[PDB]
Amino acid sequence: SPLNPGTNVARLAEQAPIHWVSVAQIENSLAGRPPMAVGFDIDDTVLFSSPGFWRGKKTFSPESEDYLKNPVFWEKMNNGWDEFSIPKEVARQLIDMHVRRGDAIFFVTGRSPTKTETVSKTLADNFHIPATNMNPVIFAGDKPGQNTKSQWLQDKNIRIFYGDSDNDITAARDVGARGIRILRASNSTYKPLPQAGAFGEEVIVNSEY
Amino acid sequence: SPLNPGTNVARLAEQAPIHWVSVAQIENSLAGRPPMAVGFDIDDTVLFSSPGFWRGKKTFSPESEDYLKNPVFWEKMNNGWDEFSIPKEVARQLIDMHVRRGDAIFFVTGRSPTKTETVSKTLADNFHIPATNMNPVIFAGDKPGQNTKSQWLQDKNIRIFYGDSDNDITAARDVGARGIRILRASNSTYKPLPQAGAFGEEVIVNSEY
Amino acid sequence: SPLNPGTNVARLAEQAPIHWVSVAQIENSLAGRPPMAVGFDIDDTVLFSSPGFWRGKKTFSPESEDYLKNPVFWEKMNNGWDEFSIPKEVARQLIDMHVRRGDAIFFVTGRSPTKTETVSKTLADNFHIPATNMNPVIFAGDKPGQNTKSQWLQDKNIRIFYGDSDNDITAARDVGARGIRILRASNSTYKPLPQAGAFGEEVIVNSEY
Amino acid sequence: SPLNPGTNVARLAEQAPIHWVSVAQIENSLAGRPPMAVGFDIDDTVLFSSPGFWRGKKTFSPESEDYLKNPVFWEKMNNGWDEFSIPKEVARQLIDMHVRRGDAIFFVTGRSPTKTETVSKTLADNFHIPATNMNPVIFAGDKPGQNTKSQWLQDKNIRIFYGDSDNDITAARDVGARGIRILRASNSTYKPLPQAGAFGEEVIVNSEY
Ligand SMILES: Nc1ncnc2c1ncn2CCOCP(=O)(O)O
Ligand SMILES: Nc1ncnc2c1ncn2CCOCP(=O)(O)O
Ligand SMILES: Nc1ncnc2c1ncn2CCOCP(=O)(O)O
Ligand SMILES: Nc1ncnc2c1ncn2CCOCP(=O)(O)O
Ligand SMILES: [Mg+2]
Ligand SMILES: [Mg+2]
Ligand SMILES: [Mg+2]
Ligand SMILES: [Mg+2]
Predict the structure, then answer these.
(1) How far apart are the CA of D68 and the centre of ligand 3, in A?
(2) C41 is catalytic
(3) Do A205 and B21 touch (CB under 8 A)?
(4) Rounded CA gap, D8 and C207, in Å?
(5) Which residues does the annotation say bind substrate (chains A, B, C, D)?
(6) How many independent structural domains does chain C possess?
(7) Nearest CA to ligand 3 atom 3
(8) Active site residues of B
(9) Which pairs count as long-range contacts for C32-36, CB under 8 Å and 24+ apart, including other chains?
(10) What is the least distance, in Å, from the CA of D11 to any CA of chain C?
(11) Which domain holds residue A144?
(12) What is the rounded distance in angstroms from the CA atom of residue A18 to the CA atom of residue A26?
């Protein structure tokens, strides 16, 4: 790359044509709507969980992605490594707003199912989710060639789904639900970063933290 | 204002919650829709006309805004000083797009009316608007015998109005047309700059030039 | 281009490695330095003069760049079309600061020399430059294959030179002077926009207006 | 905080007056310079270590900062919780660059000292630092028998110190070393984010990851 690439003011001002929204704008768009089911992706949507994925990679498959298909990894990831996962502020704000609305709150994750899991407790605890709004996390798993989330959004009648991945947005689209994008943080170990806004979907401002 | 204020990455990544759109997105939204009337504000929407307004302020009221109520100024402004106005590329793109659709093109200005005007010719020439799509500039306002921007949009069944000022957006909203915002350039002499998107309207990307 | 290109937060936060400065920072870096000669480029540095260049193009060579070698154009451009040129705020601030310092102020322009010129008066007037700091504009002209400015920076012992063009910065470099970049506005008819910072030079923040 | 705040192009193009640099620019500045001692702060400079700090706050002082004065926390933090810390790519690039130069690599941390520490191994492993360039982590501070970050930089003749906090920059400045700033990530639990560039120091581009 050039040592001194420079810039110009067209470039400095240039905006991607993205429908950006705030939590306040979402809440307003739902004003007077009665309680409904809504859902959240977990990783890079409500939890910065890269710490535990990074430990798993290093412990179980330093050269490859094999750790993500290792049951010994998932058993660690789902039963205590989320103690090191950093809650996202956008998620605190979204979840408070949905509890305010009286909405049923679901978490739908591509993480693999394990014998036991403490993830539901970590989420209920960290985000102050009352018993009545909280539901046990759905571990839909990862199966290339299939969006494992879509069936679950349909089964739970989820009408809004938040996620950082293209699969989160298209799971919502698959069922006619409203898909809303959260920015994956740039220090996530899950790379490349997705193209937020790539489906014409809403993207929440400042949602990387 | 510290000499060395510094910054941080939250501020660097910070986005206003704005519904940004492109010309391509607007065109996409109109696919299959029959020819219709569309409208443009003039100043800082299709022409950077500050050069003529700057000269008029210096010439007719260097220490006030009285030049804007001075018939002598308007006669100059509407009969040749737009030879120094700079066409905005966002407008070239939109007018080409609407002409290709077979839309009727209208211009609705709050400039004071004059005995003669050469602004219609300047616009048809600069923007290569065919005679069949072109319409004489409409001078809207609140002087006796005039109609407001709103009433003209209603009269001409204008379905989409493009403008840089709050009043262009509200004019369209008042009659249920689609108000679409264009950025006023930072070097405009019409200050302060409006808050594009202040009504949750669509704002065109990169529309300051 | 894709209809919905999207973005990510690495891209949103990404900064070119540019030495950005404020007028306050420049003034501080010169604190206690005795009066010296400094110089300014005119076009897109102190004056948004695109109005007159745009009129010249349209009047004299709508299909080409031939107007810039037409003496009939320069005679118009240098004797009254700068009445439509919009002073830049960065230049008001820079020039006030240099007058404060007791600096000798020069304007060095690639515009062609004419029989008479009112540009010096326009500049002295618009920027409130006292007789003692003001010097007549130097019309160095345009001669491909030669930086016509460098000899003049040498002759006048100019120690700091402000400009939007690569030739302004390298004229300063040619003579060991401090070259400082001003952003060309995105609505200028002089395109493409230069790569500000391309020589490792300082670039003044917000200098497009 | 309006629901729909909008924006304008002055704000969109606005740049803080910061001396931004790249790794390539830093390396260029060191061309021909013999091997030397360089230094790195640890937390939010070379490691995103918030995961361990977040767990310690929840574990040892959920409602205060007392965990930072709790020997039990530090013993955990310095003896394994950095397996969940995420290496910053800006640090990989700088350490590789300095190692290739044959520079001595130092780490100077304000973390509390412990009986044993495994952080040196974590850093040498994660960053592939050869034994000949690696040095045991230095724990600096103001406890009896300790020396400050400044005194250690002086002691080890560290010529360049990289850090995210104000105190890293001032430490280097105090002894006449080159203080270079790295952006603290927005999802760090160490808040508020510092104003990188607050002392007119160089700030590395894109250094939040
Ligand atoms: N490196 C990672 N950091 C955080 N989360 C991760 C990482 N790698 C994989 N994941 C999980 C992504 O979620 C799977 P889903 O999108 O199907 O729910
Ligand atoms: N500086 C200016 N002050 C007031 N009006 C101005 C100025 N520059 C241009 N204009 C015209 C704005 O258009 C009026 P409209 O928005 O009613 O069409
Ligand atoms: N379109 C233009 N707008 C403003 N200034 C212009 C334009 N075209 C040419 N110029 C003059 C550029 O200055 C020549 P210099 O950089 O040698 O001083
Ligand atoms: N949340 C935190 N509060 C205080 N210190 C913290 C926190 N997270 C990480 N750290 C360590 C910062 O390093 C201390 P140093 O800058 O003296 O090396
Ligand atoms: Mg995810
Ligand atoms: Mg207007
Ligand atoms: Mg110039
Ligand atoms: Mg630190």
Answers:
(1) 60
(2) yes
(3) no
(4) 16
(5) 109-110, 149
(6) 1
(7) C50
(8) 41, 43
(9) C33/C101, C34/C102, C35/C101, C35/C102, C35/C103, C35/C104, C36/C103, C36/C104, C36/C157, C36/C159, C36/C160
(10) 9
(11) 1-209
(12) 16
